[PDB]
Amino acid sequence: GKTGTQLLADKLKKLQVKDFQSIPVVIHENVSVYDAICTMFLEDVGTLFVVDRDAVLVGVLSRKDLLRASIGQQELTSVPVHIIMTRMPNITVCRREDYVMDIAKHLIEKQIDALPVIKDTDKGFEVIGRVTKTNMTKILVSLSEN
Amino acid sequence: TQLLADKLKKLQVKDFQSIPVVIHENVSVYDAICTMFLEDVGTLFVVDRDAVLVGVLSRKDLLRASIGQQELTSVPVHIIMTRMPNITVCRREDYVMDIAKHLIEKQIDALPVIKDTDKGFEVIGRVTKTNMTKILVSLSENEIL
Known part of the structure; x- marks a missing residue:
């Protein structure tokens, strides 16, 4: 990307749920x-x-x-x-490999504080984490540094 | 990259408020x-x-x-x-990164935005973890400076 804000956007777009989840x-x-x-x-x-x-x-x-x-x-x-x-x-629901920003968009659209992170199994979805507006708030803070 | 981070810390509450x-x-x-x-x-x-x-x-x-x-x-x-x-509390002139840190420590979803008048703290906005989440989304879409 061409500007520093575009470089920030590109990195933010690559962040995955597995790295920014809370315990369920x-x-x-x-x-x-x-x-x-x-x-x-x-x-x-x-x-x-x-x-x-x-x-x-x-x-x-x-x-x-x-x-x-x-x-x-x-x-x-x-x-x-x-x-x-x-x-x-x-x-x-969302999965470990999904993008954090796509989940943030869902939180905002669905007017809810949290989504479960699940793993697909033969019996249905097993809950392995939670991602929340608090998680998003923490990412935002961290940007300001590094 | 410090300079970019120094810009982010300059974004203000007035631009990212909700209805109190x-x-x-x-x-x-x-x-x-x-x-x-x-x-x-x-x-x-x-x-x-x-x-x-x-x-x-x-x-x-x-x-x-x-x-x-x-x-x-x-x-x-x-x-x-x-x-x-x-x-x-906070004021419209306060910085969003400051408020975001307070929302995290205090483990609360919202703070009141107030104005300092002849009468005292009058309520004029609310700022929340939803607002902060909206900012993070806007940054990810290159929709701010």
Whole structure:
């Protein structure tokens, strides 16, 4: 590329998820909404990925979903999370080899803080990481130095 | 390459703000949760009778309050809000890299942008980890200087 900003853009475009992921926080689908909330504060995350008895991705839960559940008219804190989780038709994943910038674009478009990183297996998607707006914020800071 | 890095640190908040959402300090916790879903934002800025900033309330704090046992239809937000020793503000003239660092340490999604007036801190913007993420995307597309 011809200018220093173009060289910066080219490098940013090559960054891969495998290098900029966080550890994932995963709960089983039959854990209660209350237990999910406790896990969120225990682990200090704002998103949880939900898996089945084979540890395959079945759902995602955001802090907003849990607040909604907790404050509403129905008693939902006692129910299994699979009642309230976002399901697979509506879940976006990414893989280790994908580009960080393409994931950032998804975060912004889908108005969500985190995506799961998965590995394809014969049983479905195994969760191996998380990439978040916080990860992106860290990349931005690092640019200013080196 | 230092010089490029020196340019990045010169980018300012005014160019990468969002819309702030404000609530009065006497609103119930239930009413503030309602505002948070209506507005679809994750951080509320609390003001006093004089429209002066007195606190902040994140979605986390509201979840903390809701999975508790107080009559939150009763409880005014001043009871649980983070108060004005422990709040980090910024101004439109501040540098985005500075703010980004504060968002990271403090582990919060948003800071209030305020103006310094005759009356005190008046709220004029919000800056978030989404804003920072949008900057990173713009840089990757060569859409800034």
